[PDB]
Structures are given as structure tokens and as C-alpha cells.
Amino acid sequence: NAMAEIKITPEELERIAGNFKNAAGEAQSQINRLEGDINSLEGQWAGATQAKFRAEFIQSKQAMQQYIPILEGISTDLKRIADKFRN
Amino acid sequence: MAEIKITPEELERIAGNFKNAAGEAQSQINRLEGDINSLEGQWAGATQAKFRAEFIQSKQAMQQYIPILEGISTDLKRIADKFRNTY
């Protein structure tokens, strides 16, 4: 039987791709603000305390460094399909 | 201008930033999951499966990130409480 037709438009795929790209940017911005917060505590208490918080925060950075490229990959895969559908 | 001295109020402010960030992160992954869900039945199953698999990867990174932020919030609050009970 005939292959089952596509209902999604390239424009809609591109809108969702935009949501993923923008989410990735928001995520990076968020971690940047939080990093500023941790930075601000340095020198205002014991170095050992600051080190504990820096280490915890770096863990969150590492998780975000996994997350962001996945979102960007999804965004780009969506755009690649929209382009293929359109042309 | 002087560097801002640490107080329980400062630690609570920063703890709140981490807590709010966790909530914003949960909201983001929820919205993106909604987007992936909306593609169901709109194109081929193999295509949907691919994007679902990629998305689940991002969700898993997020499920690591969020508790790390909540941990930092808790640790900051712990210290704020210690300062109040003993800047």
C-alpha cells in the first residue's frame, strides 16, 4: 500500500526547531547566571566551603554540557527534515 | 563599591535562585516534551521513534541537573540557618 502521508509542514517543524534552539540558549543563560551567584561567594567565607559549592556547581555544568548539544541536535535534525520536505 | 558580605539573607537569596532555576528547568523539559508529543501521528513512526529517543536523552540529562540544583539550594539554606542560630 501507498506510503502513509506526512501531515506536518516544514514551517511547523521549523517552529519546533526554534523552540529547541531557544531552550538551549535559555539553559546556557541560566547556568551562566547561577555561576555568577557562586562566583560572588568566593572570599566571603572559608576556601573549603567555597570549594564544596564550586564542585557541586561544576557537576550541574557537566549535566548541562550533556543537555545542550542534545537539544541543538534535535533542533538541527528538525530543520534538516523541514528542508527536505520543502525542497 | 564593596564586595557584598555574606549573611543568611544573601545565602537564602542565592538558594532561591537555585530552587527557581530547578523549577524553570522542569517547565522547559515539560514544554519540549509537549512539542515531541505533538509530532506523534504527524509523520512516519520510525521518524517519531528517532526523535523520541533523542529527546529521552535530553530528559535524562535534565533529571541529573535538577536534583543537583536542589542540592545546592539545600546546602546554602543549611548554612544560612547555621549563621542565624550562631555575620
Side-chain angles (χ1 to χ4, degrees), chain A residues 33-42 45 49-54 56-57, chain B residues 6-20 68-84:
Chain A
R33 291 189 303 269
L34 295 173
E35 193 163 37
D37 284 344
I38 296 295
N39 287 350
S40 74
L41 297 165
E42 170 81 301
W45 57 9
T49 304
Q50 180 65 17
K52 158 193 162 179
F53 281 99
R54 179 64 69 193
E56 284 189 75
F57 186 72
Chain B
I6 290 180
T7 63
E9 294 89 350
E10 289 296 351
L11 294 171
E12 288 170 340
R13 174 181 65 80
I14 298 171
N17 289 346
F18 277 85
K19 182 184 192 278
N20 293 340
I68 294 160
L69 299 189
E70 289 165 309
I72 289 165
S73 178
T74 294
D75 289 345
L76 290 167
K77 178 53 169 156
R78 288 190 214 235
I79 297 168
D81 289 340
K82 189 179 90 201
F83 285 7
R84 276 222 185 74

Side-chain angles (χ1 to χ4, degrees), chain A residues 51-68:
Chain A
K52 158 193 162 179
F53 281 99
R54 179 64 69 193
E56 284 189 75
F57 186 72
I58 284 171
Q59 287 193 296
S60 82
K61 286 186 67 170
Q62 284 168 345
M64 196 57 99
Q65 282 159 10
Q66 289 194 8
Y67 182 67
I68 288 167

Side-chain angles (χ1 to χ4, degrees), chain A residues 6-14 82 85-86, chain B residues 42:
Chain A
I6 309 309
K7 322 188 176 192
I8 201 89
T9 66
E11 289 81 4
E12 172 70 356
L13 289 172
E14 286 161 350
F85 284 179
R86 178 182 282 113
Chain B
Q42 293 283 282

Side-chain angles (χ1 to χ4, degrees), chain B residues 1-3 11 14 19-22 25 29 31 41 43 46 48-49 51-52 54 61-63 66 72-73 76 83:
Chain B
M1 287 187 49
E3 288 184 323
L11 294 171
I14 298 171
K19 182 184 192 278
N20 293 340
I29 199 68
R31 288 191 309 268
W43 53 9
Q48 180 68 16
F51 281 93
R52 180 65 70 185
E54 294 172 37
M62 187 45 36
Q63 285 171 343
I66 291 172
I72 289 165
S73 178
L76 290 167
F83 285 7

